[PDB]
Amino acid sequence: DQLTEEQIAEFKEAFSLFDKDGDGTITTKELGTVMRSLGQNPTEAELQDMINEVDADGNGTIDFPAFLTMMARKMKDTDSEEEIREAFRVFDKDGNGYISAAELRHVMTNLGEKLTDEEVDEMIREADIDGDGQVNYEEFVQMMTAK
Amino acid sequence: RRKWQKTGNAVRAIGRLSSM
Ligand SMILES: [Ca+2]
Ligand SMILES: [Ca+2]
Ligand SMILES: [Ca+2]
Ligand SMILES: [Ca+2]
């Protein structure tokens, strides 16, 4: 693994989901909105503390170069399981263990992604490796842990 | 994998910012 053009482009796409006003920086407001869409309700202090730990220029916001350094870095001890599990719960709103097309579309709309029916269907098809029409927790993990 | 990758990277970003 080495940093590639393709990865930088994926990282820019992820940055843009946070930078909702498209001004080139992620504020505490923008970070909190995405976290709430993904099943958390961070305190004001947690938000400022997360941003400060990647803001060497001290403007209280995250720019792309700092975001990119963060996402590329070789990093080990992370609460990735916790985060993926909470995300799964916000998709699986009825708690039946499976994410439906409708549930998927609901969350994607909340993240700012107005998916077409073709896109929703393709998303379900890519994740539905066991072929049952719906995305279980194990399938979700595979899609969320792809490098 | 484009839309799944974006969503995953968003969850990854939140996880790393929290840990770091
Ligand atoms: Ca912004
Ligand atoms: Ca900054
Ligand atoms: Ca469900
Ligand atoms: Ca399935």
Rg of chain A over all Cα atoms, to the nearest angstrom? 16
* Long-range own/partner contacts, residues A53-62 (CB < 8 A, 24 or more apart): A53/B17, A53/B20, A54/B17, A54/B20, A59/A25, A60/A27, A60/A28, A61/A25, A61/A26, A61/A27, A62/A18, A62/A25, A62/A26, A62/A31
Contact B9, A72 (CB under 8 A): no
Main-chain phi, psi angles of A30, to 5 degrees: -65, -40
Resolution (A): 1.8
**Identity of the amino acid at A22:** G
Contacting residues of A for B14, CB less than 8 Å apart: 34-35, 38, 40, 83
Mark yes or no for CB contact B15/A78 under 8 Å.
Answer: yes
Tell whether A34 is within 8 A of chain B (Cβ). yes
Q: Where are the alpha helices (DSSP H) in A19-136?
A: 28-37, 44-52, 64-72, 80-91, 101-110, 117-127
Q: Which residue of B has its CA nearest to A70?
A: B16
Experimental determination approach used: X-ray
